[PDB]
Design a binder for this molecule. Structure first.
Ligand SMILES: Nc1ncnc2c1ncn2[C@@H]1O[C@H](COP(=O)(O)OP(=O)(O)NP(=O)(O)O)[C@@H](O)[C@H]1O
Ligand SMILES: Nc1ncnc2c1ncn2[C@@H]1O[C@H](COP(=O)(O)OP(=O)(O)NP(=O)(O)O)[C@@H](O)[C@H]1O
Ligand SMILES: [Mg+2]
Ligand SMILES: [Mg+2]
Ligand SMILES: [Rb+]
Ligand SMILES: [Rb+]
Lengths: 328, 328
């Protein structure tokens, strides 16, 4: 009570938020690419420098942002994706908090360059200072958006110390893009590090090509396609033969909830109870769960790392049977 | 882009935040009690009804809130605990985001009644409506604060469905109070459910009494006191004989970082590598880690469930040796 209850300064409040949603450079790449995805992009170019500690650039060929909404694109709690509780409990987009760009801007030097098909001119914008004041100025750019995040954590020096080696940090970025590339086979994604191209995923409107290109040939050889459907619950993807799964292959344990990369304990357990009951070790897989958004809650973690299902036992059993069925 | 980028309505934005910090009634109890603790309370009375789905009342004998700051006590991003980045990287209080009361208010009917030693009159306040407008009116109350949360999730009906049985929900509350009672032996804490008193922890200025009263006699009998200190790192608490630890006793695996109930994987692993190397199963313990706030980061999860240590390997090894030493 010595200190008066007071509203935190805009930048500091955003930095507090940034600590919860932006752990490392990979986290920045994750949010910006998901933004690009929500914008209907079909091609995404990601340029990384020094593990992302120096620069993180993401360009997409999405619908872009309107000149008079760029500042809103950087303001707290501002979003174009949802506008009510009804929209929230029926999420149909990767973003919905309207916080990512604001959090990231407060902990780096972020620039937003964009143009819409209806605009003849392009514009760039950036927040700045204790009050996160926004500047919008002229620019040259194609229809679409380019995000530039430089000096990550430069104003929160203590967080930078948690940064691992550049190589390590890039590996986490590379892993994120992997997870995202598996989520959207229809999107072309190019990733470069230090001027050199590391990968270029080709869009698929046979996914076997990309699957192998992303997870390796080893997985593709052991991969068993899945097609499981009940009421409105659907399970797709691939599961490897437990008897022919190695520790290396076990590093591939990806699951998605309505196209959103998730890491659910309920899902993994269901999948294991199936490989255990059959084999009689750690399974390798790439599963996609499709469900009515009303039956799942994705507003549990600020980074969307978790989800909770309204009918927990029903969903678990659905995946169990689904996997178990394929193994036989 | 069909929908314009727009600032979310105050209540909805808070509800989005509430989904990340307030999972269940126990979560509400956690935040409010921590508030009471930060306020210097030495006695805290918690009245619960129907698992907390009906009512959650917390009264403390802390310093209270100033009349002209009650609305600020409910506004977003408003706090009296920190005011700069320097304060953030040196956290010395349980709260610091200035968000809890605002999140909780948007998902229930919350009332704040309080009075300071300098005030002759008491006042109560509550946020309300889409814009979370605040009302402050006269009231009768001792020096201290009373929080009343009724109808949890009444305006977010879908979240209420995730509510388990009243008995189950109260058990999670009971567990939280347990963890908190172990964190502050010097605080009297009374917990009641449906008019009936469930427990009453007595303040200690020999902690063995409370320890037994909280974790059971079984633990007290197997408990081995710890006193480990290095540079500024300190480890205190109790660890049970692995050879004499049962699954029931394994349910007691509590650890604290600067008095804050945490569940760190680094800490648990270090503790296990010690019981493994000695015994040659799951250990039972109550450990307290004291460290310079600059060496730890507690701004990782909106609920403060996690932390990251600047010198990870140093801390892990510190606890390993600490425990390992006691087992021998
Ligand atoms: N690459 C992009 N292309 C088009 N619009 C974008 C892009 N990045 C951001 N936006 C717009 O900026 C708004 C702000 O983005 P962001 O700050 O990430 O919040 P969000 O996507 O709404 N929700 P969240 O990520 O959950 O916090 C979005 O709602 C879009 O309307
Ligand atoms: N029981 C209480 N006694 C005295 N002051 C209180 C109490 N509960 C809340 N407050 C005051 O209200 C402010 C708001 O509380 P709260 O909304 O929980 O945010 P916080 O404690 O600052 N941070 P956080 O919990 O991390 O979001 C605090 O900073 C206190 O100054
Ligand atoms: Mg987003
Ligand atoms: Mg608090
Ligand atoms: Rb925004
Ligand atoms: Rb507040």
């Amino acid at each position: 009570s010595h200190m008066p209850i007071q509203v935190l300064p805009p930048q500091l409040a955003n930095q507090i938020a940034a600590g919860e949603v932006v752990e490392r450079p990979a986290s920045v790449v994750k949010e910006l690419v998901e933004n690009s995805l929500d914008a209907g992009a079909t091609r995404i170019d990601i340029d990384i420098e020094r593990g992302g500690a120096k620069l993180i650039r993401i360009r997409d060929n999405g619908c872009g942002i309107k000149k008079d909404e760029l500042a809103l694109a950087l303001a707290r709690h501002a979003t174009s994706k949802i506008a009510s509780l009804d929209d929230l409990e029926a999420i149909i987009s990767l973003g919905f908090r309207g916080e990512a760009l604001a959090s990231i801007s407060s902990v780096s030097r972020l620039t937003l360059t964009s143009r819409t098909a209806e605009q003849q001119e392009a514009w760039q914008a950036y927040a700045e200072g204790r009050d996160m004041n926004v500047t919008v100025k002229p620019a040259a750019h194609p229809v679409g958006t380019t995000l530039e995040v430089l000096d990550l954590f430069y104003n929160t020096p203590a967080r930078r110390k948690f940064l691992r080696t550049e190589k390590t940090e890039f590996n986490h970025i590379d892993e994120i893009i992997r997870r995202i590339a598996l989520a959207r086979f229809d999107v072309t994604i190019n990733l470069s590090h230090n001027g050199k191209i590391v990968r270029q995923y080709r869009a698929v409107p046979q996914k076997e090509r990309r699957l192998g290109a992303i997870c390796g040939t080893a997985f593709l050889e052991q991969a068993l396609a899945i097609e499981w459907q009940h009421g409105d619950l659907t399970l797709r993807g691939w599961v490897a033969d437990p008897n022919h799964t190695t520790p290396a292959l076990a590093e591939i344990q990806y699951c998605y909830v309505n196209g959103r990369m998730m890491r659910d304990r309920l899902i993994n357990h269901a999948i294991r109870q199936a490989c255990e009951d059959k084999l009689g070790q750690q399974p390798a897989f790439v599963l996609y769960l499709e469900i009515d958004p009303h039956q799942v809650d994705v507003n549990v973690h600020p980074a969307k790392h978790e989800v909770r299902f309204h009918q927990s036992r029903l969903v678990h059993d659905f995946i169990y049977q689904g996997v178990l069925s394929v193994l036989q």
